[PDB]
From a paper:
[[name]]-hydrogenases represent one of natures’ most effective classes of redox enzymes catalyzing the reversible reduction of protons to dihydrogen (H2) at turnover frequencies of up to 9000 s-11–3. With their low catalytic over-potential, [[name]]-hydrogenases represent excellent models for a regenerative and likewise economically feasible H2 production. Their active center (“H-cluster”) can be structured into a standard [4Fe-4S]-cluster ([4Fe]H) and a diiron site ([2Fe]H). Theoretical studies suggest that the most probable PT pathway comprises of strictly conserved residues E282, S319, E279, and C299 (from surface to H-cluster, numbering corresponds to [name]), including two protein-bound water molecules (Wat826, Wat1120 4XDC19, chain B) located between E279 and C29915,16,20. In this study, site-directed mutagenesis (SDM) is used to investigate the PT pathway of two [[name]]-hydrogenases, namely [name] and HydA1, which represent the largest (M3) and smallest (M1) type of monomeric [[name]]-hydrogenases, respectively.
Corresponding to earlier crystal structure data, for all [name] variants a space group of P1 21 1 was observed with two copies in the asymmetric unit cell (chain A and B). According to their close inter-residue distance of 2.8 Å, R286CpI may function as a salt bridge partner of deprotonated E282CpI and thus could be involved in the PT mechanism. R286CpI is further part of an extensive hydrogen-bonding network, which includes the carboxyl group of E282CpI, histidine residues H565CpI and H569CpI, and surface-bound H2O molecules. In case of variant [name] significantly fewer water molecules are observed in the same region. We therefore assume that the loss of the guanidine group in [name] destabilizes the network of proton-accepting/donating surface-bound H2O molecules near the entrance to the PT pathway. However, as the essential chain of PT pathway residues is not directly affected, the influence of this exchange on catalytic activity is comparatively weak. Variants E282DCpI, C299DCpI, R286ACpI, and E282ACpI were only mildly affected and showed residual activities between 30 and 90%.
Author numbering: 2 to 575
Write the structure that this text describes.
Amino acid sequence: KTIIINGVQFNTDEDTTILKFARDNNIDISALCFLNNCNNDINKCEICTVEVEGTGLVTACDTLIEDGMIINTNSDAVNEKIKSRISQLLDIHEFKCGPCNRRENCEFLKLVIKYKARASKPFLPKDKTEYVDERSKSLTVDRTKCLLCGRCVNACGKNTETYAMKFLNKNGKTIIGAEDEKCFDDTNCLLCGQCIIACPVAALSEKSHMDRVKNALNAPEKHVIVAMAPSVRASIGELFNMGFGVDVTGKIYTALRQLGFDKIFDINFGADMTIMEEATELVQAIENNGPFPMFTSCCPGWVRQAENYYPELLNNLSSAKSPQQIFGTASKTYYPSISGLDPKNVFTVTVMPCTSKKFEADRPQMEKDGLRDIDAVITTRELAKMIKDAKIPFAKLEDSEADPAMGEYSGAGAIFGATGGVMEAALRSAKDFAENAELEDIEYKQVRGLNGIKEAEVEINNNKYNVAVINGASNLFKFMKSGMINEKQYHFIEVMACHGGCVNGGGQPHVNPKDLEKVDIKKVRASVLYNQDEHLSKRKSHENTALVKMYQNYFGKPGEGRAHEILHFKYKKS
Ligand code: 402
Ligand code: SF4
Ligand code: SF4
Ligand code: SF4
Ligand code: SF4
Ligand code: FES
Ligand SMILES: [Mg+2]
């Protein structure tokens, strides 16, 4: 093909869109509703407008290149068209960037600045209560910011295949929301927050828990524990212009100490706990020749997916609590026993890359003796905002260590944030358990990677079993519907709601499509975790010294007794 773009001649054999071809050839074309190789088919934003000679104005994001095309991307007709569209968007947009949580990384603002657009008449609502929905424990909607770009709808469609995020006709006007405009919690929504990640503006956010945390920190009698997820240490640096794939663990510890937190632990410890209980459970399931298959239960998005679509699998879920909830359970029991603290005065806070964790933490039965396992859950973005509000120079902070009692962890718990991590860790412990040995080769690279459905054959006590790793909720739906589950007899299956694992969680830092093109965010974030794994002395969860001490002195043997009594949680079908 011979393509003419801005007077420059190209000769290509590629069959792609004008947008992609221009992007690959250093030619600037703006875009808004185009994301995940999809645009808003019904009401296209037309920000990607270009002028094709002989045809007129077209949308470059969904228009294929053709030989003989003379394309103008910067003609004044194009520019005033785009500016017109952006102006129309401003007409329905509360343009107050000051107290906005997307102030420092908003695509729409950058478009407005770029094309110097102004609203015909400024959108300034007196009563935002009609536009705001905070009923959910995980998600919040602010339709004063919504551009109706449909990126959340699409993202929900491709990531989960639930379409829990829909276009709705709210008595006259088009909005986005859950079915029947109900609270997302009351629908088949997984609360995975991929819709948030896809949103270019502040229309979609996480349900804030920062006030819980602040009030806890300022409360004189409250002893505040904080523990961050595996993924957090490999992600938050992005929000401080430190780049991608930067390990900032120690900096996070220091910052958390400077935020006034009373105890600094780590969720990876709880991951090691989860591996203790669940590998014990898998070994005893193997010895009893059932029940098979056993699914992981550490992902609340997947748990909700089972509750809403496959309730018959609820009893197939591991009884072991998620790292978060099991850590929280241990923090209200074991920790006071080794600290002398009043359990009622303990306030446990987790830092998560996930929004569904908020819902999981606020489950009614996720407590004992009136004491919540987890009292508050803040996202990576929330912790970043908290650090910035305290004016803490994160990038320049020196490394510190976590409090050892419940802060030590192995590489097995370290790789949890990546797809296949839980599987690999669980195998590392189960193989050692069932064979009564301490094996040398512990790397299971077959369950790693970004393949949607991963399958492996493992040999435990010289008998072979089939394991599977489901990477994404849509892939769970594919795995079940296509009958792949019934092809062979699977024994242990990992399921994560977010593709790539927790490192691509709904509470993770937003990434400009600019870097989505240049950086493989999932692999780059996971690489930090695996790098931590290969550089750790202990790479098995049952070699965690602090954890071993905890079990020996307090819980006893995992999988049974008080361990099974309080560190486990089972879900019931209706
Ligand atoms: N609880 C828990 Fe997990 C652990 O450890 C996180 O904390 Fe994950 C991460 N990162 C999240 O959110 S949940 C699903 N299992 C894999 S990793
Ligand atoms: S969503 Fe973006 S453009 Fe709108 S107020 Fe917030 S920062 Fe400004
Ligand atoms: S909530 Fe965000 S992603 Fe969804 S339509 Fe509105 S602006 Fe677009
Ligand atoms: S939280 Fe997940 S399942 Fe729910 S609407 Fe958003 S993307 Fe869809
Ligand atoms: S994969 Fe991780 S971040 Fe995503 S919903 Fe599950 S627990 Fe949350
Ligand atoms: S980006 Fe092409 S129509 Fe929206
Ligand atoms: Mg399209």
